[PDB]
Amino acid sequence: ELSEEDKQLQDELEMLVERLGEKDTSLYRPALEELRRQIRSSTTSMTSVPKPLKFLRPHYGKLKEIYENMAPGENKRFAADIISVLAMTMSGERECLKYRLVGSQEELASWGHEYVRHLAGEVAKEWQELDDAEKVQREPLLTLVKEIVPYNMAHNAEHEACDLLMEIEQVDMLEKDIDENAYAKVCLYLTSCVNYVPEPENSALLRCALGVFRKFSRFPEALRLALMLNDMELVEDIFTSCKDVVVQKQMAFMLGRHGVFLELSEDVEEYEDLTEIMSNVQLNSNFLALARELDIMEPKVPDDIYKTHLEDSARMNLASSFVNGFVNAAFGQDKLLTDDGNKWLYKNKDHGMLSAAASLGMILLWDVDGGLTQIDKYLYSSEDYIKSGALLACGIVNSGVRNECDPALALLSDYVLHNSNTMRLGSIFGLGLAYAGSNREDVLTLLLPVMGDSKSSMEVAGVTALACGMIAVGSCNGDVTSTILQTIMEKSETELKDTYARWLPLGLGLNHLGKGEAIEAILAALEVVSEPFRSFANTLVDVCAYAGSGNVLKVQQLLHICSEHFDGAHQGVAVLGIALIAMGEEIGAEMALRTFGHLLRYGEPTLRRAVPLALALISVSNPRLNILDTLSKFSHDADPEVSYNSIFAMGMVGSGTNNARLAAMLRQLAQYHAKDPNNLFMVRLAQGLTHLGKGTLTLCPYHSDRQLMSQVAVAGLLTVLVSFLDVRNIILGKSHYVLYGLVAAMQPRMLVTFDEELRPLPVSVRVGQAVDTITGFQTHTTPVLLAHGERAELATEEFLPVTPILEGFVILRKNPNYD
Amino acid sequence: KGPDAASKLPLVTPHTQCRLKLLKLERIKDYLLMEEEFIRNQEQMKEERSKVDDLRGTPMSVGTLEEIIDDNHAIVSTSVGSEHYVSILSFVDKDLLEPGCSVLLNHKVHAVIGVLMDDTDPLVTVMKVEKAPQETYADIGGLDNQIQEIKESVELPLTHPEYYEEMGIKPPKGVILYGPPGTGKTLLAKAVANQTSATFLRVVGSELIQKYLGDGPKLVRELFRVAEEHAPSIVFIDEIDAIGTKRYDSNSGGEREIQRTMLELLNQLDGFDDVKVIMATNRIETLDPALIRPGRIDRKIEFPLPDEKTKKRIFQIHTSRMTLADDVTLDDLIMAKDDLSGADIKAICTEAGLMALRERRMKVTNEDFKKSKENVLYKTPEGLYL
């Protein structure tokens, strides 16, 4: 079954191997050289069937024995190389490297590409299986890697090189040898890997890619990787170590979009301009301008959203106030409150006035002057309800803008003191949400004392815990951590059972967000609380720490906690946990959805009620039928808690979309539930969220490329969802103001282009669905609002933008090389 | 009761064998292990109705309700053609029985005792889609327009059902994809089923016709009934020309039954409410004009043979996974003005890979492609036109 030439070559090779086996000991070298010539000549050819390897496969053991029994010297290696190249085909006990090590060690390019690839794979295997010992044996397996990496670089196997280096765990030669054209491949490779790779390799890859970007001076990309890393130090370093001012301005846009604010000294080129940009003081004016484009500068009223005409006692007024505030958020003008809000507040009764007034700030978001002007009149009312609501309005107005002046600080520290009553929750929450990312020790030291004073009831204590935690989100601040630990220890053994204690562990975990061993230590310290609340706090802190890390083992632990029968606050928390861990990487999100479905199927009411919150968190402001129909199906569930949670999850997932087939579904739900007042309130809130900002804002805690996790937005979303974990008491009752925690996450969905003067540059752009790159062109003229999952690319080469992550505030360079 | 969708795992973006794909698959497997462990653990963790069951007939049967009478008596079909004037027990829900429902009857006395709402014909259940073909729109080269119309007909009316309302225009509830033998007609349905959130329903015209009496019309009734119970839904009828050819005066009984089933189908196409219908057809002239009447089949998408650009795109799509050799040039094969469907291009690629394997080389080449093109196509005199 072998051709004539095939059999002739087989005879030649058999004669040569017989000569090698024979103990001539005087003609081994010519035969070995002939074998090398034939084997490499066959291998270098594109044919995928090296005939010498096929023919010498059976004599592998005999060749090995001959090599073992032959005299040491040059011939030893001169045959070991052949033995290894032959063993490439047949293996099973990791012998190719074993024989190459004692080999000629010649250049790793004469042996085609497949030998290099097998070499890389097997050295990766060895490095993976080796322990901390045998460091002497790890030394030889580095020069071959140094030779391989440039080989792959030249031969377009950038992915193979990056892989091999990852498995080696020493990603140094990569950035040593990267070239100009290699970023578009290696940088994207590393960025994609980081999502699935676990720590500390996550940080290792992030820093490696950051160094790669710095090598050829990709400052915005290095800054994006720094932001990925939870450390506002490399961000300052990269911003400082820059020479161009336009790129610094764009980096300042993106930093302001992020929660980091850098307090530099008066040494940069334009300190005032850069700090103003990073503070986004002009954000209100830019939002108003974008409103003027595609004119939507017309506030709409709660009945307008409801559309009850086609197809006033206690709660519907509050719902109307909420939806009005949501729809007119940040647009300033309102047709029910701005015109005459005093009568509206007065017709509101009970605790409603708090939120009814805070809606004024929500409407006058990012507009300090307008907020002050429209809130001063209501700031002085006989009832402290209106005063506290006004304080919330001012806090909301200040939230989102990092003005160096602190009118919010002054006004609200004036009232931080209980003033002989517990109605300072408004002041505390306003201060928190206003200074979310500030992390000013001034506000920390203003808040921590009032938190424990023998008169701060659990309501105040929880509000201030949320506030301080979201002030120092993800920083592991010793003072805040210690004070919260002490208060948790000393609160009580019985009152902890009552609600509003859920927020102290939230403060802890949110301060220690994305940290790890820090929460391990804090848990070790916190193991002495009690039986019921200790597990709750442990799980909540754990999730608030590994939010977005995608730690499969941790979410497995949380799944076990969910599964164990409790006959269940911690069980409910663990659902939002699973959601929060999966809230990052895209691939795990759908599996988290499958887990949520299976939980809703085989779950007790306790976690059944939590599942909708998990759905909303996993798909916030990304309304897709896959989740919306499940939420609608379970909306009619018998459990009122489940129904309320599902409806609010629908509202959140539809937040800032104005989505049809969701507005209609909400209208039908309201029609069915007209007789249920609590459920009517919930559906009205869902409509308010759906029409939030009349389709100009998103609650997504992901801005850059759906990849950068925004600490402040995550803080707001998680605090709101934890508050709803028990909807009946916290929200369907006295403390309905907890809804306003959404400000930390609310963020406009815009795309505003600028020249190198902070001046708008109306230019046509193409927007469409990402392909991982653009499909379904829907080009318009900037500025253009972008829907979730839709990316924008310039329709023409007229410019030279400063970012490949074009979104939000983008500076455009009028420097095309050739037009 | 809402849609049914089709379970499908996420898509691993990298088609190459790389650590991105390996880690993505590892995470998928991790989550699958989590699901299995959660199940195992949960199902390990875990009088009046007895007399209700006792009163209910032991081997109770399933029949169909007809012309409910009184508040305690009704006419029910035994499911063998016969019907009875049966009574109703207080056990059943009541205020819930409607004609056509699949009620449960005591075996001996034949008295209504249950409602069994979820009664689905095994044929309908099996033709319902559970998996989801892994053919996203990205796999379709060319046919960009056709993709646009199909999305406007079955996708936009669900994702953004405000544009139609804004101008008071009803969505098209029927799209017939007509074309030569193989151009992507079934691919577009595959992609719609993959990417849509609606309950997909595969059917072939040659399946709806059963032998026993009126089971054909009854099965069409059941199919569209379930397509209504679930919503939104997309019913894909492939090779409808099995039933729907030019209606003609029957000379026999089987032909009369076939025409009756086709008429039953046309009747069920007047039950709006959001159940989209996608017909497929190789030869559209044979179809009756009644079906293609512009009130039941709103859109007709022609799937013409691919042009040079479309053929190029198809070739890159179907060779992306192939270790193409640098020597190859993908223009000569395309622009040779000969008929070439997308299926023909896939066959060309497969035969080229097989030719390279026969030559013992894993990398395809220009000569391999030429030989593949020569040996794949099966089927004007020379000089008469220049």
């Binding site: 079954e1 995928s48 069937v49 090296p50 096929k54 496969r57 | 064998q17 790389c18 698959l25 894993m362």
Partner: peptide, 29 residues
């Protein structure tokens, strides 16, 4: 001028040309 594949030929075709993680990838799938 057409040949028939051999067992060693096909074994070489399977092993020689493949990225090092092919077997693990197939196993996980």
């Amino acid at each position: 001028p057409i040949r028939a594949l051999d067992e060693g030929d096909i074994a070489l075709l399977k092993t020689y040309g493949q990225s090092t993680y092919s077997r693990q990838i197939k196993q996980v799938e």
